[PDB]
Amino acid sequence: GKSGRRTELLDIAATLFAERGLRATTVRDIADAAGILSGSLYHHFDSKESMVDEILRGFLDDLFGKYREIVASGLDSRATLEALVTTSYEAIDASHSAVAIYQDEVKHLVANERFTYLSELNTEFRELWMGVLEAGVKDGSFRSDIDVELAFRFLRDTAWVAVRWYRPGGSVTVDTVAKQYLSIVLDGLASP
Amino acid sequence: RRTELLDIAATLFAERGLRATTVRDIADAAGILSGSLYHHFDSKESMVDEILRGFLDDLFGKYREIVASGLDSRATLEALVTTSYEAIDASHSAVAIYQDEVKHLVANERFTYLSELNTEFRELWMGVLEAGVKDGSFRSDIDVELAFRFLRDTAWVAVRWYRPGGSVTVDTVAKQYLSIVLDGLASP
Ligand SMILES: [Mg+2]
C-alpha cells in the first residue's frame, strides 16, 4: 500500500516539476494534483528538495551505470559512441520527466550543497564521452580535423534536447530517433 | 543610457531568470534607483519584449534574405546556421532568454509572435531542407521531419557555454558544427 503510494506521489511531483519548473512548483501544487493536502505528502517525504533528489538520482544512477559499463564493455569506438547516445535516447523515453528536469530545470541546483553530485556527474560525463572521442580519433574511427572539445560540447548540448518534443508511447520510437541522430552526426546530412 | 540599462536587464534575465528578477534587482545592478528605471521603461515585461524583438527582428530579417539570396542548398543551410551562431555572439543574453527563459510566456497573449516565429522558422528552414533533398544536396534516406527537428532543437544550445572573447571565435564553432552535421564525425 504505502510504498506504491509513495512512488505514485513522486511520479506526480516529477511530472509537475518537468512541466512548471522546480522553483515554480510548490508542495501544495503536488498535493492538489494527488488529491490530498500537503500534510499527507510530508508523511511520505521530508521535503520538496528530497523529492527532487530522489527523482534525479533514480534516473542518473541508472544512466551513468549504463554509460560506465558501455565504455568498459570492449565495443569499438564508433559502436561505443552509438551505444552511449542510444542509452540517452532510451532514458528520454523511460524517464521523460526526470530528463526534462535534468535538461531544463537544474541550473540553479548548483548553488545547493545537496546537489554537488550534479557537478561531479558533469565532470564525469565529459571524461567518459570526450574520452571515447579521443580514443576514436587516435584509432582512426573519427576525423582528425574536428576539435574534440567542440565535438564533445556538441554531443553534451544535444543529448537531451529532444525531451522538449518527444512523446513516450508515440508511433515514433525513440530508437528511430536515435538512429537518425546518429546517422547525421556520424555520417552527415549531405549526400556522399 | 536606456540601451545600457536594457543590456544590464538582459544579463540578469539570462543569469537569474525572468521570474527571479525584480525591478529593484535591475536597478541595483545598474547602480541606479528604481524610479530612474521607470523613466525609461514602464515594466519588466516591456523590457523582455524589447530585448526579444530586437534580437528576433534582426535574425529573421537575415534568414529571409538568405533564403531569397539564390545560394545552392548546402550553402543556404550553412549561411542560416552561421547567422544563428553570430546572434549567439552578438546577442548572447537575448538568445539565452529566448532558448531557456520564456517557456512560461509562449501561451501569453502579448508574446504571440513567438509562435508565429516557430511557424516562420519552419517555413524557411524546412523549405531549404526539402529543396536540398529534392536537388540531391542532402540525403534522400533521412526522415526530413526528424532532420528539421534536429536543426531546430540544436540552433541555440551552445548559448549555455559560448561567450564572446573565448579562445576561438563563434565562426570557428559554427564551421565545426556544420562540418559534423553535414559531413559527419566519422572518418571517410
Ligand atoms: Mg512539454
UniProtKB/Swiss-Prot annotation, chain B:
Species, as recorded: Rhodococcus jostii (strain RHA1)
Residue ranges occupied by any HTH tetR-type domain in the UniProt entry: 1-59
DNA-binding region: 22-41
InterPro entries named in the record: Homeodomain-like_sf, HTH-type_TetR-like_transc_reg, HTH_TetR, KstR2_TetR_C, Tet_transcr_reg_TetR-rel_C_sf
Single annotated GO MF: DNA-binding transcription factor activity
Domain of life (superkingdom): Bacteria
PANTHER family: HTH-TYPE TRANSCRIPTIONAL REGULATOR RUTR, HTH-TYPE TRANSCRIPTIONAL REPRESSOR KSTR2
Protein name per its UniProtKB record: HTH-type transcriptional repressor KstR2
